[PDB]
């Protein structure tokens, strides 16, 4: 495989399906990425991850720098051989989840030079830029500080990129876009972006507090001022209706904790929307917890059983739940790319919303 | 298969190696069985637990009916589908895990007449008598009350069992011998039990403080007091070591929580003995946790990892290390019985424990 190429397959409105090739496998876009907080998707093996359908993780970068180390991991073979998973990774750049910000970068050390040599040294495939990602709400002046900053590291983080061969030869570099809500700063930093030149953009600065509104009204101009011909990465999205809007508006990759977060938490997700399996009612329902899906847990246990594992604290609750909410939005995601791919996705969205509510 | 047949198929002095055939599946002997807490092998799906070679697992009485509640396992299709294993599970009566005493039984209710329909209503396979397990150390006065005690509940445990024929027709009775530390008083049980008569002997009162001397020399003389062509099942035994050397003491059944309980605590089996893999000098190990163990955990993950995981508190570390540390135990057992099929067992038992310590 190349070290990176994106085609689109088919098309609907602003949405698009095909895929992404890279030295370590195919993505198919829209793709959800599970995300891996301290080199693991929470309760899962990499073979149960792979078997849900996912093509690439998600990476913790401030996790892992912490613990347990990019040095020691590089020491160890690299984030793949550590974990076991052989196919795509994306990191984080840090530029979210970390303290002291100068325009060198953040200390609590992080800059772009940093940052860059931290996903080289854990081997990641795809790598994010350092950028700062801006607090909601924000005021035009501090968002457009807070962009400003985030395209002249954008700058520095092509730079360190490229000038590390085997990273450079070897994997792909993202820039993110921000600007808060306010079209003129993202289009300004859409233009950095293209300028310097990227493998794929992502939407940075979302899913920050803001609602489902909001979040779509910034999408409806934002997307469309990325380069059409590479990837858009809504980071941190979301909720499976989020992922469905963020698609009709031209959105290719999605992440989001909420599967594994509330799957721990007792939420699963379903075709008829969320349920909350802690809730008394499931004690003796023996239905799979959701009606539909093919994911093995479905095929194998019942609601009243995992109602008991989360009730009483067990692990392998946990389990379950985290490899039915994966699978969730594993099937989402190909009912998503084939609908794109049969010209039905916008009849898909709205049947798919209908019932979800 | 037939409701009950245990057949010996080799011997070495007092160890003994066979089967033990029953409706839902064959049982290997000697075994070791995983133990269940609350419905769930902590931390496996039972598809794992049969993986590492279990053939049956412990189920938990005390939990189960607390928590969900036996009739409400009865109305879900009993503990088997309930839980997703369809092989052979013993329940204890819980005779050990819960108050107030007095000859009924134990209010905290429990009966022997309760404790087996408990069983039943579970639909436990190996039901064991409901006892009084003597607290150790004991005086002969007080062990001989609670072991008299105990033989007029295992009479009333075999007339309940039989007076439910489903229950008498589909699963097996185990009698518990009691009397501490006592000859005289194991004696007394062991010649009460058989006059009553059961499908195997447990031998309780056991893994309750002593030490492993004084347990060995239990055992030298309380199996050979039981019935030879019954299992006799160690109950709450144990370590590695322990097991080897109640095998060569006549026994053909174990359960513990150490491979689970501790696993989750960072101990690992190896045959070199046990290791702490929280101990920093296995951050940067990337050998597997045993150097021979044919564990999917040791194919695919070194102890560097596995540290990482266990020291981040993250779920997969426990998965990991009770993965492991039941295949331990399973390759355990299985080097018995070869050993004992062979006629090399006291070899066996003699290298295993040079190396181990
Ligand atoms: C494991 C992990 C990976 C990534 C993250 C933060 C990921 C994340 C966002 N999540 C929601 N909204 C987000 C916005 C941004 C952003 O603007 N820049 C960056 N670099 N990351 C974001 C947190 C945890
Ligand atoms: C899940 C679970 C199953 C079984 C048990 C207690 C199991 C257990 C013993 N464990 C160690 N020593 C033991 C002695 C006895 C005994 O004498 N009688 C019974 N009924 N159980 C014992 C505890 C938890
Ligand atoms: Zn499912
Ligand atoms: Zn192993």
């Given at each position: 495989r190349p070290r990176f190429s994106f085609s689109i397959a088919a098309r609907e409105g602003k949405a698009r399906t095909g895929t992404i090739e890279m030295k370590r496998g195919v993505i198919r876009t829209p793709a959800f990425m599970p995300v891996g907080?301290?080199?693991?998707?929470?309760?899962?093996?990499p073979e149960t991850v792979r078997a849900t359908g996912a093509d690439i993780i998600l990476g913790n970068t401030y996790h892992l720098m912490l613990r347990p180390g990019a040095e020691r991991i590089a020491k160890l073979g690299g984030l793949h051989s550590f974990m076991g998973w052989d196919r795509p990774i994306l990191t984080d750049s840090g530029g979210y989840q970390v303290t002291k910000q100068s325009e060198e970068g953040v200390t609590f050390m992080l800059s772009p030079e940093r940052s860059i040599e931290i996903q080289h040294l854990l081997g990641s495939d795809i790598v994010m830029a350092f950028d700062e990602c801006t607090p909601?709400?924000?005021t035009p002046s501090r968002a457009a500080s807070s962009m400003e900053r985030s395209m002249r590291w954008a700058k520095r983080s092509r730079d360190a990129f490229d000038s590390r061969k085997e990273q450079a030869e070897n994997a792909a570099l993202f820039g993110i876009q921000q600007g808060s809500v306010f079209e003129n700063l993202r289009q300004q930093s859409a233009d950095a972006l293209a300028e310097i030149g990227f493998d794929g953009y992502a939407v940075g600065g979302?899913?920050?507090?803001?609602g489902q509104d909001e979040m779509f009204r910034v999408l409806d101009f934002s997307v469309?001022?990325?380069?059409?011909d590479k990837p858009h990465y809504l980071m941190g999205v979301g909720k499976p209706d989020d992922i469905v809007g963020a698609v009709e508006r031209g959105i290719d990759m999605f992440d989001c904790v909420l599967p594994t977060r509330s799957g721990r938490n007792g939420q699963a997700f379903t075709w008829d929307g969320p349920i909350?399996?802690?809730?008394?009612?499931?004690?003796?329902?023996?239905?799979?917890?959701?009606?539909?899906?093919?994911?093995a847990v479905c095929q194998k246990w019942s609601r009243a059983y995992i109602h008991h594992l989360i009730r009483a604290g067990e692990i392998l609750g946990a389990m379950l739940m985290t490899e039915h909410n994966i699978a969730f939005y594993q099937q989402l995601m190909q009912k998503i790319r084939d609908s794109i791919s049969e010209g039905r996705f916008s009849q898909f969205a709205q049947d798919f919303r209908a019932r979800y509510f």
């Amino acid at each position: 495989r190349p070290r990176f190429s994106f085609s689109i397959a088919a098309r609907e409105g602003k949405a698009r399906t095909g895929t992404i090739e890279m030295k370590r496998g195919v993505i198919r876009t829209p793709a959800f990425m599970p995300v891996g907080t301290a080199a693991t998707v929470k309760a899962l093996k990499p073979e149960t991850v792979r078997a849900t359908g996912a093509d690439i993780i998600l990476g913790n970068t401030y996790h892992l720098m912490l613990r347990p180390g990019a040095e020691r991991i590089a020491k160890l073979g690299g984030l793949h051989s550590f974990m076991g998973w052989d196919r795509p990774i994306l990191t984080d750049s840090g530029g979210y989840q970390v303290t002291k910000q100068s325009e060198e970068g953040v200390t609590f050390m992080l800059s772009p030079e940093r940052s860059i040599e931290i996903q080289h040294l854990l081997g990641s495939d795809i790598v994010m830029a350092f950028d700062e990602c801006t607090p909601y709400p924000a005021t035009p002046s501090r968002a457009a500080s807070s962009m400003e900053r985030s395209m002249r590291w954008a700058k520095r983080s092509r730079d360190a990129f490229d000038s590390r061969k085997e990273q450079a030869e070897n994997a792909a570099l993202f820039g993110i876009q921000q600007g808060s809500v306010f079209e003129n700063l993202r289009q300004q930093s859409a233009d950095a972006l293209a300028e310097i030149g990227f493998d794929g953009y992502a939407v940075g600065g979302l899913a920050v507090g803001e609602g489902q509104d909001e979040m779509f009204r910034v999408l409806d101009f934002s997307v469309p001022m990325l380069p059409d011909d590479k990837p858009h990465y809504l980071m941190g999205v979301g909720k499976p209706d989020d992922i469905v809007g963020a698609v009709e508006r031209g959105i290719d990759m999605f992440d989001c904790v909420l599967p594994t977060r509330s799957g721990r938490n007792g939420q699963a997700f379903t075709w008829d929307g969320p349920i909350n399996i802690r809730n008394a009612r499931f004690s003796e329902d023996l239905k799979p917890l959701d009606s539909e899906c093919h994911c093995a847990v479905c095929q194998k246990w019942s609601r009243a059983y995992i109602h008991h594992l989360i009730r009483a604290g067990e692990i392998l609750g946990a389990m379950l739940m985290t490899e039915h909410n994966i699978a969730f939005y594993q099937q989402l995601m190909q009912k998503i790319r084939d609908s794109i791919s049969e010209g039905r996705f916008s009849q898909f969205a709205q049947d798919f919303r209908a019932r979800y509510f």
